[PDB]
Amino acid sequence: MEELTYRLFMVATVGMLAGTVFLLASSREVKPEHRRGVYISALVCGIAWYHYQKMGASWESGSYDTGLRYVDWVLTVPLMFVEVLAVTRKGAAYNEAVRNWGIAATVMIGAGYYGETSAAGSNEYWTGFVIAMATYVWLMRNLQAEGEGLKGDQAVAFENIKNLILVGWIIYPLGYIAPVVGDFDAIREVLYTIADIINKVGLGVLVLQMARVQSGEK
Numbered sequence: 001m002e003e004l005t006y007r008l009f010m011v012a013t014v015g016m017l018a019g020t021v022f023l024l025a026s027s028r029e030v031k032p033e034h035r036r037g038v039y040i041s042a043l044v045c046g047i048a049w050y051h052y053q054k055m056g057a058s059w060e061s062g063s064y065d066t067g068l069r070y071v072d073w074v075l076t077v078p079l080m081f082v083e084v085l086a087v088t089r090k091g092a093a094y095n096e097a098v099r100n101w102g103i104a105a106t107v108m109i110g111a112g113y114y115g116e117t118s119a120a121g122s123n124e125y126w127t128g129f130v131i132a133m134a135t136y137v138w139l140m141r142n143l144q145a146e147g148e149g150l151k152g153d154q155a156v157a158f159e160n161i162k163n164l165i166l167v168g169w170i171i172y173p174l175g176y177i178a179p180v181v182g183d184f185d186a187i188r189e190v191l192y193t194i195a196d197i198i199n200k201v202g203l204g205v206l207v208l209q210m211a212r213v214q215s216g217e218k
């Protein structure tokens with residue numbers, strides 16, 4: 001398990017860089033007025049690239065710092081919401097949602113960090129899990145409500161974005177509780193890494209697809 005976890009960190013590091021530069025190179029494929037979300041998606045992957053380089057070295061040392069993962073999350077999750085919410089809102093509606101979801105994400109990630117750095121299975125560990133879970137469900141329920149009236153290609157493209165988040169983000173609570181289901185400390189790290197690649201590279205790809213649709217592309 002330890003070597004598999006190291007190899008996955010090293011592969012995910014290159015994967016995040018690849019996501020970054022692919023998204024940048026792909027921005028010419030959409031109209032200028034729809035490139036912003038592609039650039040923000042690339043920024044998300046680029047921040048992750050920086051942190052994954054650190055995480056792989058941290059894991060390789062044998063004294064692993066999950067604070068590298070959580071600081072990556074606290075910066076990148078609110079950014080990922082920026083372009084999700086831009087599809088459905090602008091102006092005052094957008095500002096309020098971006099702020100409120102960002103605050104919620106910060107509470108979720110902070111509660112997770114509090115719990116994960118507690119003794120596994122302790123009351124503190126479960127407190128962090130339960131607070132994070134409730135905030136997570138609140139976020140997902142807000143997300144499900146966004147874009148309900150959309151029709152056509154833009155509705156399909158936005159539902160693909162929504163469903164990637166609704167399904168793909170389940171991996172994180174599974175990873176968090178993997179160490180109490182078995183001798184699986186490393187499996188937590190495996191699951192977080194797989195989740196980040198799927199969710200960050202995947203969301204960038206779907207935001208690019210959303211921008212092609214908005215560009216009038218088939």
Ligand SMILES: *C/C=C(C)/C=C/C=C(C)/C=C/C1=C(C)CCCC1(C)C
Binds near residue numbers: 176
């Ligand atoms: C780019 C990274 C992303 C999208 C990270 C998302 C992480 C979360 C959805 C984590 C949520 C957690 C819970 C729902 C409960 C256990 C604690 C967390 C923080 C792992």
Ligand SMILES: CCCCCCCC/C=C\CCCCCCCC(=O)O
Binds near residue numbers: 020039040042046
């Ligand atoms: C805690 C410190 C975090 C440091 C993160 C550094 C990440 C930098 C990686 C490359 C980002 C490049 C993404 C392109 C930015 C948007 C594109 C554009 O503006 O034209």
Ligand SMILES: CCCCCCCC/C=C\CCCCCCCC(=O)O
Binds near residue numbers: 107110128
């Ligand atoms: C129990 C509810 C907690 C609410 C948290 C409120 C704000 C906390 C913000 C998120 C912190 C996540 C980043 C922590 C990692 C850095 C620590 C380190 O590097 O040593």
